[PDB]
Amino acid sequence: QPAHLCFRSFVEALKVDNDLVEINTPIDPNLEAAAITRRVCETNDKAPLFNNLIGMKNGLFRILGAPGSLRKSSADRYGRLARHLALPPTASMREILDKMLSASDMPPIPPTIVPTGPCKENSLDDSEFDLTELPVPLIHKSDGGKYIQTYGMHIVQSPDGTWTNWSIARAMVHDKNHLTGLVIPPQHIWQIHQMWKKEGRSDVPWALAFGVPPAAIMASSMPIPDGVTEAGYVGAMTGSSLELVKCDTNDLYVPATSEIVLEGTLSISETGPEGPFGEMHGYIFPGDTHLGAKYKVNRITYRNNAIMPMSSCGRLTDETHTMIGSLAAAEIRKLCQQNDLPITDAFAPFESQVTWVALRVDTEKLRAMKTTSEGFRKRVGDVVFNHKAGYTIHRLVLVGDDIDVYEGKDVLWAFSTRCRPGMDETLFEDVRGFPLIPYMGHGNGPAHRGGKVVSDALMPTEYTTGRNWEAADFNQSYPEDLKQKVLDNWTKMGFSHHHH
Amino acid sequence: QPAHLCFRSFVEALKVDNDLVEINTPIDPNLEAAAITRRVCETNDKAPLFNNLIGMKNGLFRILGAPGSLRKSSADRYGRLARHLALPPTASMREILDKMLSASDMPPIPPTIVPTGPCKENSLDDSEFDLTELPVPLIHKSDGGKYIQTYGMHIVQSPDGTWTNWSIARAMVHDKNHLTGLVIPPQHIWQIHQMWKKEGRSDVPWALAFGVPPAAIMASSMPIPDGVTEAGYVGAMTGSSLELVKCDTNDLYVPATSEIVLEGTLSISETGPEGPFGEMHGYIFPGDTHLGAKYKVNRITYRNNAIMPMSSCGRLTDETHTMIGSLAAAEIRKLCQQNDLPITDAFAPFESQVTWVALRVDTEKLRAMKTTSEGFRKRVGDVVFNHKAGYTIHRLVLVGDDIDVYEGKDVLWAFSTRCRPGMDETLFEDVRGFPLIPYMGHGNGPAHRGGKVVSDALMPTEYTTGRNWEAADFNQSYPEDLKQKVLDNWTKMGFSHHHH
Ligand SMILES: Cc1cc2c3c(c1C)C(C)(C)CC=[N+]3c1c([nH]c(=O)[nH]c1=O)N2C[C@H](O)[C@H](O)[C@H](O)COP(=O)(O)O
Ligand SMILES: Cc1cc2c3c(c1C)C(C)(C)CC=[N+]3c1c([nH]c(=O)[nH]c1=O)N2C[C@H](O)[C@H](O)[C@H](O)COP(=O)(O)O
Ligand SMILES: [K+]
Ligand SMILES: [K+]
Ligand SMILES: [K+]
Ligand SMILES: [K+]
Ligand SMILES: [Mn+2]
Ligand SMILES: [Mn+2]
């Protein structure tokens, strides 16, 4: 099976790429696996595959860390991501995000039901497993639980059957047969949960699939629209219908090649302690436990030699930056275009801890709008900050066409030199806020509301007559023929490869 | 003579350091020299010495570019700066700034007058030079003039004789015997000029010395207090009295080893066209010429084989970032401490285009103040933004003790995650603004007023009971003995020098 359609094949692809380190000696899931993974993510090293995990029994489980993290070289920086999507490993961010957006104007390709698959190679019923006996990792020293779920896909369906959502949300072991996790507004798992709670008749049928098709875990991390079934979006994006098998104990369907599948229910009534967790913005607040959603596990099925993917998330750079930030930015780009805003590109700079999105403006189109910064800032912020795709983002930075939003140094240059604090900004207090940012949930104001801003780094003539500067840089402040002379004589004169 | 006391010796030191490229074939001062220098500054390469400058006659002049720019290696990143100050080339920023501040609580060491020096080896009177015939560089393709003065020191004295100021301010050739340049409030050259204008009797006696003692050009770029003669501050900092010789045509004194000296007057009445220039924030606005101060040159004296230092300034990284930003930050650190604010460190992040200063707070001291963010932000902003040392700085970022302000990634992390936009900020509109920032002089509001902000990246418990998080990083989220195991087994397992 192709790498983008089968996690086991994705692991092979990373090996083949010289992007994997296989560790075959015993590694402790209590912190060691995650510490190694953390170091990988902070240094952009090869992904670690822990084949000898202390506490692994009857095939559960090996761990792959850093599945969506960065490579060291600039030329294949995003290559792990590219390998989720059948793209060349040198694909740019723009190409990755375009691939992720491509299904938005295509018919869905619904999934195909098949009678079995590798995820049925082994099973454990309700008398045979104990989640506290599996080698679930402690990912950060102060975590409030062993976070089994950092890179699997929750599967829940609306009561009417018309929408089946796939998404990543964290969860940790509660006891032998339960998890607790985050289920928070405006996320689709929360929206579906609320539908079941209003109906009031039963707990939500649920599955959690680990080691799913890489193209599916990417969509699972993207805020595609309300009511859109991710399986059909992934089918359209990849050009192929995904193969799913039915759960044994419920009527949900899971990818056939899933490494590990939990089947059970998400309670409409019960909660349990959840967190704290070392989170995407780089912090953990020890002791900060709160009631979270509670899942009951009735069945486990799994591949022979099952592999659990794991995100050791925190400070730069890991899946919570490369996927949450970039895929939200992608959706925001589309949302602005569909609202008739002249946005060409969007990216969440890593330097902002993916709390900003830079929006590149087609300033020829802006000029024709015959508008002002105040009016344009307000329009952009109202579109983005009132929508779920803007949930995680607290600062939007508007930049003109000279800026590559995929280059954080250029975004920071433009922000710092073109946006006058206060005057060139509009604050938004009456919008949903992202509580996980420390300045929100642990800050001075409401954890769930406000704290957002549009920062206009467009210069005044970009609204009127056009850009009226040149950069004081090598590229723009010297003619072409001089530049090329300099370059051609560079090493000759005494001064100092793309791939590397 | 030591490198910090003699520019010619500084050039040797750079050679000795393997930090110089000597270019002995013809190089055009019309853009080529500055283009090469620009490329050096954007890539942190070796400093260029142009020994064969097209238009060099009778010894005027060779050019040294990038005198205060960065080296590629992390271990001696600031080594050019260190070589201005007799520090080891591996000196940290903290050590450099401490050296620059050290004279603030020492008695001045006044200069020593000597009868001659190398700067008298050659002279050209009022019938023998023409500034339009010298190989003055065109530094950026759209500049409004040939900027002879990017790294020399203007020398002006108060009418009463009690204060002699040394400072860098740009100037360009106007005609055979005049320059025009910036002379703007609140700068000391402007403050002294105003004293002469109020007296109304004569033009200001003036000298401009190029290739001065490196320790003197550093002080020339620092906002030491009003009324303090830089020569005595440099004497105290270096432990030695600087040797000066009298000008021929006026009673000012110049460093004995100056490479090139202009003597003349700064008009109290006349102005001439000045600019535009490719400036420190990375831009030039073509055509944006304004009336500037006008200098008359009556005499040139110079060393045999004189060398003109040149800053090819603009986008990162050059002297306008390494010296303007860092030395302002240094003075701001001291100013806050003298105002009883618990600031331990200050630095202007390069990523902010040196428009921000990050202030590291001793949070134990802050706790004992029993204050709040609103009150503390206001106090800090009032101290800094009402003072000349804060002139160039538009955003102050307050951070706690865990942040290394000399590390821009950490400042950006803290800003982005700990400062809630709006709520955690105080805007300052009734303070002097720095017009050279594009969003000021080419922006939506008053060019000279406002646009400043204090952004509080202290978390709430840092004011009360103490830090209540741990970072989700390798350093803080794993015990010491695990960390060290990981490190010790890193290359063994398969994963990947300080000097490089
Ligand atoms: C990539 C990724 C995405 C996480 C995530 C992580 C990763 C690695 C973790 C597990 C390591 C840390 C926490 N995560 C959560 C999360 N969303 C959320 O509601 N709760 C979370 O706990 N997300 C973001 C979530 O997947 C996106 O917001 C999706 O848009 C949600 O899908 P939906 O649009 O269908 O609701
Ligand atoms: C290092 C450096 C400092 C420049 C400078 C440059 C460099 C390389 C240039 C020449 C390349 C670009 C423009 N510069 C000017 C400037 N200050 C100013 O008033 N006008 C300027 O034109 N400065 C900053 C000035 O030197 C500091 O603000 C000093 O504190 C001024 O000294 P003072 O405190 O004695 O007034
Ligand atoms: K999703
Ligand atoms: K603006
Ligand atoms: K000075
Ligand atoms: K704060
Ligand atoms: Mn969804
Ligand atoms: Mn001064």
Numbering used by the authors:
A (entry chain A), B (entry chain A): 4 to 499, 502 to 505
Paper text:
The UbiD superfamily is composed of a wide variety of (de)carboxylases acting on aromatic, hetero-aromatic, and unsaturated aliphatic acids. Prenylated FMN consists of an FMN molecule modified by the addition of a fourth non-aromatic ring joined via N5–C1′ and C6–C3′ linkages between the flavin and prenyl moieties. Following binding of prFMNreduced and formation of holo-UbiD, the cofactor undergoes oxidation to form the catalytically relevant oxidized prFMN species. In the UbiD enzyme family, Arg173, Glu277, and Glu282 (A. niger Fdc1 numbering) form a conserved ionic network.
However, when Fdc1 is incubated in the dark, activity remains constant for many hours, even under aerobic conditions. The respective enzyme preparations exhibit different UV-visible spectra, with the “dark” protein preparation displaying a prominent feature at 380 nm and showing subtle differences between 340 and 385 nm compared with protein purified under normal light conditions. High-resolution crystal structures of Fdc1 purified and crystallized in the dark reveal that the prFMN cofactor is exclusively in the iminium form. As illumination leads to inactivation, these observations directly confirm that prFMNiminium, rather than prFMNketimine, is the active form of the cofactor.
